[PDB]
């Protein structure tokens, strides 16, 4: 029923800047712009608001984040904030995000790692229902419970538990990838990751599969079969005792029946690195999988994704060598060799500048500009090697964490905007505030 | 659009009726997480200030002023406006669920806006300013004013009031920031401003004054001197000796905005110097909160009686420990009449009543400092005392306006007080406006 | 100004897309409004005998392209001719009313006789594929050389440049060959054009078709002739008597779009187990789907859309969508209500624009202007069609009226969320020549 | 944005300078195909009417009015506006190439618009009407008027004139429909309307009249009767006896629209009753064409001299065979003064000149009927005669306004006359506006 102001409709989910000639990094973000903050901040000293997910279709946006009363990471009950809204314009021509349905989902169930997607029926959610820590989940035999929910245009929420005993038979743990999903054709597509049980069909299918991705102009000096050894062990990090940590994609038919006809796609690990959080993006006619750099590879990754009815295929990724993320040694931001780790942080890149033949040239995102610590969020435009002039939250050292970015255009002014939702350090009210930062994309001629 | 039925009977009523208990045996819990319905700034210089809030038995209304470049820029601003309903999650936790969330931003500069929840939506009274307050007090024409409404459909409409007639005796005039109230088919707003010297309204107040006193803390000045100082408190030096006057504006609620407005000016034998304020309705009682911008520090609630289109004020309730910071000689501990414009908006919400409806106790968030806007502290107050408190921080913390509203989740038998407070911010602007929530407990 | 223009902002997001995505509604509950006034961007004749005919139209997300052929002395005069060319953008007035705003408007009139021209909107302007004709079609099928062809382009600066194709090589296996009149389409760095003509008997291309045929059938109306007879007839339908039994063949030509015209041309010939006898046609791109429209010049009357997939420089066609009430007039035994395979060259160009889709992108309904007559080119009526039925109609006239070719393209004004269909129709004229080419406009309604 | 160099020296000049030849030995060719730059209607009731055309040595301007529901409807309308340049194809065939093609359609009802090609683009003068002509003659305020411009960038800007001051003495006032002309840093538009009875402008025409006569066809009425009829002709009965008056408006051409407008009201000892018209510039001569809305049938061209911001008119050239249909007693063959509002806009383009610049011949498309708007016929005319003609049809055919402009393709040594004509349509509304093109030939 509700729809964005027509100022935005033709500029959402599109290839924003089509340019074959200009240097990608001649495009750069403006100063942050003041607009209607649609993301609730904590109201107590210990309250934890973390794990944002965001998706926007040409009719509405969907947003969610997790809330824990007593502090973050606490093994405790949690609830989700959920919002459904539309873009509007003031009389002065300034965009604002206008939320229509704004609820807390807080009941007997502990929904974690939730991803959201804007579908024709409202805001679809994929969550894990957890009663164990991740550490414990990798040791129990049963897969993790998972639920497909929807906040409807009427503001009501309904959900259906998936049959994970069947759907995730070959897994010991499984979680949505936190980043948004995408509605494609008649289905909703969500990133998933978790652990495979040893010697299952899915595990055997990945036996001996690996890929080594390299830094630009910065060769790993290690011997080659040593690199191969380390790349293989990177799929089985020591934190969970040698279980293969696997990337997947889950598609669900969009219908008034939730959980209808789900299909799991597991790409070969000759393409994907160790399973991690991620996001399914649709820009123009192209789809991508973002995968968080939780393993040894630091440059931001976008795997081209093509849809084959109910399944997907991924292709060799775009990489953005200056769009690093912090991580612990030996997988810090400047890392160049394969190795085994679980680290990094979710900071996704939004496809922004394209050739006319639709090859991606440049992305926008907010990176944490530090070698090892989650510090100094910086918004910028990135090509395969370089980074534009940047916009920073603070000229002082500042703690931050996850960021997820989405860009859209106002075609009547030909202005490109980028929204960057970032977990930022807070004072007085909890560890984090989740801030929707807004920039305009400018050009330095 | 209506509140969840868990709230039926829990909104705008006398929450605690108790003749026997000590008032300060009631006290606020620690702050509670709920759904923060108030947008925080998103840039380093963004200014969100001046909150207004009112809630009827069907919906709530909220607004605050936004300036892009910092809080003392006079050139342009916009208002954030929200219309919403109270909800409960499945576990019984409160959340404020906004339904209509808009920025009102055009070429007009709407300032000092008050909102009120009426049967047609969220009514707003704003001044449309073209010059500073200081300049307004020096120009002969009254300040322009507008009656707006955000409807349940999310559309905003407004009508300019005929201030040339309605405020002909005034040089400057503003809504009182605090919420208004819908009573007997009219919406009622606090107003304040300056009167034209020797206008009929100014002449009607000549010689009028009132001295309100601190509990068990006598002014040592002699009575004659106190009277001179109380008279001069209505004509502070900042605006060159014009009388600064309290008033109340009522408007017929109708699809026609601005219908039949009527200005009531109480005698200054009851009211102190005009200031920001709020019209409250709790049960069948109404009150005018008046900010303590003059010499009197304790929080003030004037009982208000509605007689069709006008109202009568009565001698106020005072809450001696509910002080506010101010400049010398009108600091929080001041006890003598004097002339000043200082203080801060921190309103008290009527909470504990006698069975005969006499008010005993209030909830609010005070700034617990003598002179500086520091240290917001939530508590229950009677005429003399303060309960055990809840604080945003144990460290010294800048803050400003607070406005409080209490309600009951009847379903869970839990009484709550919302305290919307301007709190110092880091990284993103001068202030963040935070809706603090406490449960009222009993010791 | 050599840089590219763009439609008004009201249209961005509403050009070349799936206009109505609806799984549940009856297709024919959508219907056209009355015709709407807008800016007629198509020149009418200015003399008693002037012939304006053979419209071609294609519109990209940045601009539209339009052309038609002009003959001074009458329409079938096998003589010199010229082309009107227009490059423009869609606009809205202050009231929101649609208008087509032409930016480059030229007559291309020189020593060359360009015929049967198709146009396509590419990132460099308006690409044109024409035959350069020095013999009638009847003479052409009798001479061994293929027809000359040219790839031209009107640029955004208003200049026209062109390159003759190497038809002696490119069309080595052909005796005659023409573009399909209907618009081409820009897909994956190349421009794609419909083509048709005659094959050299026993040439490699001709032997690759030997024995190939397909019988397409009417809805709920069975042909009574014996099966072996139907097959004999279907086979002979590829070799009409008009050109002495040479095979008349459908094809698709793709050209790399570059400042170098005529670059890297590649011819695709689909198997005649899929296509009927070659005819005029159009390459359509709607959303992510491509289609070849094929004029019903043979025995099959319902409008045809063959799904088209692009591989690299070649195309693959699939079994067609058919719209049983979107018929066209033809001479007996291939009239509008024909149901049996037979051999004939008749019909008329009236294309269908894909309009209503399933969520999974299966096509449900089209818009077009048919000629509503069994045998004569009469009575144009605009309608929405599904596989069986026709919506409520809009008519140019309640009296009997001569018309000919129609080509339709639909678009949405995103600002108002209204869908429109343009129908460019050759309509009988009085005083000024045989035809006026009229851009009809309707809004698509739902009752 | 300029015409092809094949036209240099062929635009806006005296096309045929000849003292010797019979004017009517020049004659138009058959109509020729070129590029029809004028949109036709696309619906059954669509009304396209009231063309205006002007061409400078760099570009041409064109406009016409559009009503959705029929030609008499009065509620709302829009204008089609075109800025273009003359081109030649490789074979030398003329084509009019429009560069900017827009519909101007908003809440405002612009009527009776005239255009003129200025160095800044296509200037337009329109009335912004809120009541019918009948009702405007009865209201005290003058008609609102706007000066707009379609620029070379395709953007349109406009500014309302201060008509309460500029047209203080008028009850109604409209541009003359025919094109205006750029002369000496100002654009010049024909205007007509009604004067406030007893205003200074009205009293300044009191007792003023002029009687123009047919060639070799004297009015038999007695002289005092003719004088009374001639005076009455300026106050026709349709609008209750108000004086209907000719004028000329000049505006300074500037990035500021509506700059320094000045109105000229010529004396009615020269002009007949106010009517539609056109300001023409050909060589160094300027002329005011005035439609024959009153008793006088032959086509009229008043020589016009520009002083500074005002104009002076002189006794007109008349072309006795270039008649127009009208209702009795002001029909095509009328010869006596009378009072009427009738006729039709069909202008004559100055074509053939003596070496001393005195005009000898014009081209135009006349409606060749006594009383009805029928039978458009293109021809060359002198003061008394008509050349061999070219016809749209040998059958009786309804038509209305025509406006003609001639030019030379210097490269091919061919002179052409464009004749934009409202012609009866079938299927698509009442009229199609057709740009007819002829080559000027010589018998010899
Ligand atoms: C796309 O186009 C650009 C420039 O036109 C070229 O550099 C790039 O290699 C192309 N890639 C593909 C896959 O077409
Ligand atoms: C109400 O009752 C209290 C004590 O019960 C008394 O002190 C007070 O004066 C009473 N007031 C009224 C108005 O009844
Ligand atoms: C698309 O969906 C419709 C409706 O369920 C169905 O009839 C049709 O066959 C589907 N097409 C494909 C290719 O699955
Ligand atoms: C120009 O020459 C002709 C030739 O007789 C003459 O009639 C006309 O009066 C001349 N023009 C002027 C202005 O004398
Ligand atoms: Ca497990
Ligand atoms: Ca003032
Ligand atoms: Ca041949
Ligand atoms: Ca008037």
- SS3 for chain B is CCCCHHHCCCECCCCEECCCCCHHHEEECCCCCCCCCCCCCCCCCCEEEEEEEEECCCCEEEEEEEECCCCCCCCCCEEEEEEEEEEECCCCCEEEEEEEEEEECCCCCEEEEEEEEECCEEEEEEEECCCCHHHHHHCCCCCEEEEEEEECCCCEEEEECCHHHHCCCEEEEEECECCCEEECCEEEEEEEEEECCCCHHHHHCCCCCCCCCECCECCCCCHHHHHHHHHHCCCCHHHCCCCEEEEEEEEECCCCCCEEEEEECCCCCCCCCCCCEEEEEECCEEEEEECCCCCCCCEEEEEEEEECCEEEECCCEEECCCCCCCCCCCCCCCCCCCCCCCCCCECCEEEEECCCCCEEEEEEEEECCCCCCECEEEEEECCCCECCCEECCCCCCEEEEEEEEEEEECCCCEEEEEEEEEEECCCCCCEEEEEEEEEEEEC
C-alpha separations of C133 from C79, C146, C282, C308 in Å: 9, 11, 21, 29
From D37, D24, D14, D91, select the one nearest D285 (Cα to Cα).
D14
| D80 at interface of C, judged by CB pairs closer than 8 A | yes
Q: A with C: how many residue pairs have Cβ under 8 Å apart?
A: 32
Residues 390-419 of A with CB under 8 A from B: 393-394, 398
> Residue C26 C-alpha to ligand 3 middle, in angstroms?
15
Residue D370: count of CB within 10 angstroms of its CB:
17
- Tell me the chain B residues in contact with residue A398 when contact means C-beta distances shorter than 8 Å: 427
Rg (chain B; Cα; Å): 20
C386 is in an annotated binding site: no
Q: What is the largest CA-CA distance in chain D?
A: 63
Report whether D219 contacts D336 (CB < 8 A): yes
Q: What is the CA(B198)–ligand 6 centre distance, in A?
A: 15
Chain-centre distance for alpha carbon A441? 21
How many Å apart are CA A36 and CA B42, to the nearest integer?
A: 8
Rounded Cα distance between D248 and D231, Å, is: 21
Candidates C196, B86, D143, C417; CA nearest to A5 is C417
Cα separation, D90 vs B66, in Å, equals 65
Instruction: Enumerate the residues of chain B whose CB falls inside 8 A of the CB of residue A60.
Output: none
| Number of Cα atoms under 13 Å in the Cβ half of residue D119 | 8
Q: For chain A, give percent helix, strand, coil, nearest 5.
A: 10, 45, 45
With 0-12 / 13-18 / 19 or more C-beta atoms within 10 angstroms meaning exposed / middle / buried, residue B192 is buried
Ligand nearest to the CA of D18: 4
- B141 and B166 Cβ atoms separated by less than 8 Å: no
What are the phi and psi torsion angles at B176 (to 5°)? -90, 10
3-state helix, strand, coil in chain D (%, to 5): 5, 45, 50
C5 is in which domain, residue-wise?
1-447
Nearest CB to D33: which of C72, C401, C439?
Answer: C72
Q: What angle do CA D271, D276, D282 make, to 5 degrees?
A: 80
* Residues near ligand 4 (Cβ within 6 A): D 354, 356, 358
Burial category of B315 from C-beta neighbours within 10 Å (exposed 0-12, middle 13-18, buried 19 and up): exposed
Q: How far apart are CA B287 and CA C252, in angstroms?
A: 83
What was the structure determination method?
Answer: X-ray
Taking Cα atoms as reference points, which of B35, B188, B13 lies closest to residue B115?
B188
Residues, chain B: 443
Question: Within 13 Å of residue C351, how many CA atoms lie on the same side as its CB?
Answer: 31
How many Å lie between the centroid of ligand 1 and the Cα of residue A333? 29
| Total length of chain C | 447
The distance from CA C178 to its chain's CA centroid, rounded to whole angstroms, is 13
Separation of alpha carbons C366 and C27, rounded Å:
9
| Contact yes or no for A295/A239 (Cβ under 8 A) | no
Residue A6 has φ and ψ, to the nearest 5°, of: -60, -15
Say what the alpha-carbon torsion angle B245, B251, B256, B257 is, to the nearest 10 degrees: 30
Chain B: residue whose CA lies nearest to A154? B99
| A34, A436, A438, best to mutate vs chain B, most B CBs in 10 Å | A34
C-alpha A112/C-alpha A97 separation (Å) is: 25
| Contacts of A153 by beta carbon, 8 Å cutoff, 6+ apart | A1, A2, A84, A100, A101, A121, A122
Q: D139: annotated binding-site residue?
A: yes
Resolution in angstroms, to 1 decimal, for this deposition? 1.9
Q: What distance in Å separates the CA atoms of residue C251 and residue C314, rounded to the nearest whole number?
A: 10
Ligand lying closest to the C-alpha of residue A356? 1
Question: Do the chains contact at B91 and A103, CB–CB below 8 Å?
Answer: no
Cβ contact B286:B305 at 8 Å: yes
- First CA to last CA distance, chain A: 42
Is C145 annotated in a binding site? The answer is yes
Q: What is the 3-state secondary structure (H, E, C) of A210-279?
A: CCCCCECCECCCCCHHHHHHHHHHCCCCHHHCCCEEEEEEEEEECCCCCCEEEEEECCCCCCCCCCCCEE
Number of domain units in chain D: 1
Mutate to test the interface with A, among C6, C12, C259 (most CBs of A within 10 A): C12
Q: How far is CA A61 from CA A6, A117, A149, in A?
A: 14, 8, 16
Q: Which residues does residue C164 pair with via DSSP β-bridges, in sequence order?
A: C150
Identify the bridge partners of residue B313 per DSSP, sorted by sequence position: B304
* Best probe residue, ligand 3, of C360, C363, C364, C386 (max atoms within 8 Å of C-beta): C360
- Alpha-carbon radius of gyration of chain D: 20
Task: Give the closest ligand to the alpha carbon of residue A140.
Answer: 5
Residues surrounding ion ligand 8 at CB below 5 Å:
D 136, 139, 171
- Asked if D216 contacts D318 with a C-beta cutoff of 8 angstroms, the reply is no
Put simply, whether C95 touches A (Cβ < 8 Å) is: no
Chain C CA closest to residue D435: C46
In this complex, do A356 and C188 lie within 8 Å of one another by their Cβ atoms? no
Which contiguous run of DSSP H or E holds residue D193? strand D186-195
Chain-centre distance of CA A239, in angstroms?
23
Cis peptide upstream of residue B359 (ω within 30 degrees of 0) = no
Distance C311 CA to ligand 1 centre (A): 17
Q: Phi first, then psi: give them for residue C405, nearest 5 degrees.
A: -70, 145
Are A45 and B31 inside 8 Å of each other by CB? yes
Q: Which residues pair with C427 in a beta bridge?
A: C403, C436
- Dist. CA B160–CA B175, nearest whole Å: 14
């Amino acid at each position: 029923a509700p729809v964005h102001d027509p100022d935005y409709i033709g500029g959402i989910g599109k290839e924003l800047i089509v340019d074959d000639i200009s240097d990608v990094t001649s495009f750069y973000p403006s100063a942050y712009q003041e607009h209607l903050n649609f993301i609730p901040a904590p109201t107590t000293g210990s309250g934890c608001t973390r794990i944002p997910s965001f998706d926007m279709s040409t009719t509405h946006y969907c947003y969610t984040h997790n809330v824990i009363l007593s502090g973050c990471r606490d093994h405790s009950h949690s609830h989700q904030y959920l919002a459904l809204g539309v873009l509007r314009t003031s009389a002065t021509g300034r965009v604002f995000f206008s939320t229509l349905r704004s609820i807390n989902l807080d009941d007997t169930q502990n929904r974690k790692s939730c991803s959201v997607s804007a579908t024709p029926l409202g805001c679809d959610m994929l969550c894990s229902k957890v009663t164990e820590t991740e550490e414990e989940d990798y040791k129990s035999v049963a897969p993790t419970s998972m639920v497909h929910g929807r906040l409807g245009f009427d503001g009501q929420y309904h959900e259906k538990d998936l049959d994970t005993t069947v759907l995730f038979k070959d897994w010991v743990a499984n979680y949505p990838g936190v980043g948004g999903g995408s509605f494609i054709d008649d289905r909703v597509w969500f990133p998933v990751y978790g652990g495979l049980k040893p010697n299952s069909p899915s595990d055997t299918a990945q036996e001996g599969k690996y890929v080594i991705y390299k830094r630009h102009n910065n060769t790993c000096p290690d011997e080659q079969d040593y690199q191969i050894r380390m790349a293989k062990s990177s799929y089985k990090p020591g934190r969970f005792g040698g279980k293969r940590v696997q990337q997947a994609i889950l598609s669900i038919k969009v219908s008034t029946s939730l959980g209808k006809d789900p299909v799991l796609t597991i790409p070969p690990n000759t393409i994907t690195l160790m399973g991690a959080e991620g996001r399914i993006l649709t820009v123009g006619t192209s789809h991508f999988l973002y995968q968080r750099g939780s393993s040894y590879f630091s440059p931001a990754l976008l795997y081209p994704m093509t849809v084959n009815n109910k399944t997907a295929t991924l292709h060799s990724p775009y990489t953005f060598n200056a769009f690093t993320r912090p991580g612990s040694v030996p997988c810090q931001a400047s890392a160049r060799c394969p190795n085994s780790c679980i680290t990094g942080v979710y900071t996704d890149p939004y496809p922004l500048i394209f050739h006319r033949n639709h090859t991606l040239r440049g992305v926008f995102g907010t990176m944490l500009d530090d070698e090892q610590a989650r510090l100094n969020p910086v918004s910028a435009v990135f090509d395969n090697i370089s980074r534009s002039r940047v916009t920073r939250v603070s000229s002082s050292s500042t703690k931050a964490a996850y960021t997820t970015s989405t860009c859209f255009k106002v075609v009547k002014t030909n202005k490109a905007y980028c929204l960057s939702i970032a977990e930022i350090s807070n004072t007085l009210f909890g560890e984090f505030r989740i801030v929707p930062l807004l920039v305009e994309i400018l050009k330095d001629d």
